[PDB]
């Protein structure tokens, strides 16, 4: 059978998508939170 | 097509969120973006009262 | 026309295991009847008619169960 | 476009970086010639 | 005391005064995704609905190319 | 060429281009097609707070987020009908789940090591208690791996397997007569009543994966 | 005695910058980084420590969750 | 002619689980009996007209516990 | 050659086991009622017809498990 | 006889599964007794004879059960 | 090949034991309805429809068994 | 003639299978005792014989089938 | 060829009855829900996620059955 | 010669379902203990011998379901 | 010769009936959770690590009815 | 000849209905722990060892699933 073939980029898709979150797409809203803090306490 | 029913079985599931769950999220979030867009503004008017004392 | 005479005998007898539903359902209708009249003795005739409704509800399933043995036995 | 940030990735997911190579090589003992029934 | 009353005197003053320069005149197939359905006006179930209307075409075609 | 990775590059295309349509050029207001993304953001911020809670808390937070949004958009293939699914390809899920089972234990190696034998009982124990229950709780450890990924892979393929068996039933119920459309309307929205719960299962199967992975690295990380 | 007397307009120029110069809800975020770079400096220090839960958010804003 | 009709005394063993959960059935009104009368001791003389006379109303199902057994036995 | 029409009589008598599902089932709703209005006899005019909804909805799976027993007739 | 009358030993093995409901009725009338004497200790020796008939009445299905198990022995 | 059409005939009655979960599952949810509203009649319409959503999943298990028998029925 | 002896092999398997009734029945009486003496210790020597009376009388479904089921070995 | 395939069908019928517990498993996680809503009507905002992950663990574990039977159907 | 131990391997599993009663019978003995002692944590000192003489006779049937299953060993 | 390959999976097909040990085995624990938090709300984050420690020791202990199928399927 | 291991495969696979109570034995002991600690949170220090005591005396025999299944398949 061919169990190997999708798995080669299966979890390889994971380690590139985490870095899009952990470094790019997740923390872009945390700046959007703290900007709502430095407009809160001014 | 023998499987003609297949795209048809969300004729009304697509209509469910269009008729029964369109304001259940769009008229849920609008007050929330209303909530942020003035509680910064009203606290900003509190800055216009805090600058008046000095 | 041999072994079909056996299957109308064995399959007839398994049908009465389904009468467990009529047996147990005719039990909780009274097992919840009387603890109700225990707390409230005076108010009784509001449920004694609907209990035999609940009994007729339970026995309708068992009487729509067992007669399938004698459905086409002869 | 976007902003990059030095977020801690290797020193805290190094078991999961290692474990990705652990199961990959395990198929090299399973999908070499044992898949031809 | 004085310190909160001087931590604001820059950032209240040095920012934009009008909310000008709307930047909707930046259309080079980079921002033309959002000026059609992602403006803050309609809010129906539209951008999700045209996602599915392509993938059922992308789905039905790949066996029309394979076998049918 | 590759005839089974056709839509795997779509899965990160929806989120490498999620910033294209959610973030309205970096407004602080956060309009309606963005405020769900921060609504879905705090729904993982809350749950991994309440059952980790310690100081070393948010360091694994991106990994437990990127497991959610990876299988939350498994629901796309369960509703696009003319597709052989990727969550139905359960060989990858059950082998994605083998690394998160041992990966906490190898996270327990250099952090804890010799003390990691303390999975026997977290309370007091006499002599005959421990050495015959240790195989009963490690039965929840060497089978902890298969119990996670199979649960996702078995609930979702019935989104196209418990429904495509109906397509052989109702299309055979129409090519009989024109006056065969009797007994009310059974080859109709009764099937639609079946589909949307498995569609809604597809949401909560992702959410249960966030909770399940959160509980396992509570004790594999904390003492 | 009149040491702060020449501070008679630095808060008055802000008051004219508030009665008709308040675009607080159609402006973006990255302009404020050009205004205040320290709002990204504590971002850097709260990422490496793993502090994503910004304190001082729940007292003024909701959780926006399905709890 | 010998291996088919012999099944009438084989499927007659399976009907012993007809409703013979008396513990699921018959006994649970007697549980509800001494549940209720230990709440009001001065009510036990009006619950025997509806429990043990209600019992046969439950065992009206239990009449045919094994009537289908012996009828195809002898 | 007799076997396909022989399984018509074992293939339905085993199919009437699950008619106990409404049997113990439909009385549980009645087992909720008669101690339900024990603690509150007043509100019964609206909560009894909603229990008939539960009576009828679980009776629907009191005829499904005999539906395929009557598919024997075709 | 080796294929006809020798078959009846497995009909007995299904006859002796009917006592799973017997073992509950000689248990749960005992189970409502001990909680029945809980909240009223001075109802003890009037309920204790009204409950031992529940040991006799519920086991009457448990004893009429395996008569068909010993119908084939003696 | 009249044994396989006996094999696709014997198995419907052995696949309908699993209905009995749904026969009582819709009732034990209904069991908590009537004593649910007995503690407060002002809860009457905020617990009625959600337990029907709590009901509806229990039917699909019983609607998982009939399609097995019917795929066992039709060929 | 060891076909029927093979039937008495498997018929020994469904012989004393019926210990579920004496398995949960032998515990549910103690489920009532141990919740009984929990709520009040002033019945500690009254029902402790009477649940012992519940104990041996619950095993009347226990050792009843066994007297020919353990004795089908030698005869 | 169809003498070995004849038991693939009878397996896939007898296999899918272990998810009768999938119904009632997905039931007491709602019957124990509205006892919470009736006893504390201001807790529905936080008790709903405790049971929405409650049954998804349950009814998928009952759904392990037809994952086996579909292997023995197809 | 193919019936040396023909029906011996099948019966030893179907006899071993008696661990159900040995399973939850091993459970309520502690399950009723723990919410019992949650009513009163001072009674724990006297049920420490009552979990001795409550559990050991509870799994008296636990030896009685495997020695029947040990028809094959010796 | 290959006629016993059918006996390989009908012995595996019936092994899915052992999944109600996790079908109900995690229903009532969650049904013991979602009322146990409603009786007092601020013990949400103490019984919830108690439940997962009780969840995984119950359904994974009911999971390895899957392994006796799979090593029988393969 | 060939029929030996066929007779082992439907006996070893039918032993895994035996663990059914062993699954839901874990449920009720963890049920009344999180119902027993729910009103007394100050008891988890003392009775949570009593809850896990209900395995090492209980499931030490209650989990003999493959120990009766694969044992003579050596």
Numbering used by the authors:
A (entry chain 8): 7 to 48
B (entry chain Z): 53 to 106
C (entry chain P), H (entry chain O), I (entry chain Q), J (entry chain N), M (entry chain S), N (entry chain L), ...: 1 to 74
D (entry chain J): 1 to 37
E (entry chain U): 19 to 86
F (entry chain X): 26 to 248
G (entry chain 7): 107 to 173
K (entry chain R), L (entry chain M): 1 to 75
Provide the authors' original text about this structure:
The F1Fo ATP synthase (M.W. ≈ 600 kDa for the monomer) is highly conserved from bacteria to mammals. The ATP synthase comprises a catalytic F1 portion, a peripheral stalk or stator, and the membrane embedded, Fo region. Fo contains a ring of c-subunits (eight in mammals, ten in yeast, 14 in chloroplast, and various stoichiometries in bacteria) that functions as a proton turbine, along with a-subunit that provides the conduits for proton entry and exit. The c-ring, connected to the central stalk of F1, rotates driven by the movement of protons down the potential gradient from the cytosol of the cell to the mitochondrial matrix, and the proton flow provides the energy for the phosphorylation of ADP in the active site of F1.
This analysis was performed essentially using purified enzyme reconstituted into nanodiscs made from palmitoyl-oleoyl-phosphatidylcholine (POPC) and cardiolipin (cardiolipin is 12% by weight). To improve the Fo structure, we reprocessed the cryo-EM data starting from particle picking at the center of Fo, instead of F1Fo. A unique and strong cryo-EM density is clearly observed at the interface between the a- and c-subunits, whose size and shape are consistent with those of a BDQ molecule. The binding of BDQ disrupted the interface between the a- and c-subunits as compared to the reference structures. Helices 5 and 6 of subunit-a are distorted around the proposed binding site of BDQ which increases the space between subunit-a and the c10-ring. Pointedly, aMet215 moves by about 3 Å from the reference structures. The side chain of aMet215 is on the face of the helix closest to the BDQ molecule, and would clash with the EM density of BDQ if it was in the reference conformation. For instance, the phenyl ring of cPhe55 is displaced by as much as 3.1 Å and accompanied by distortion of the α-helix. The cation-π interaction between the t-amine of BDQ and cPhe64 is likely to be a critical interaction that stabilizes BDQ binding.
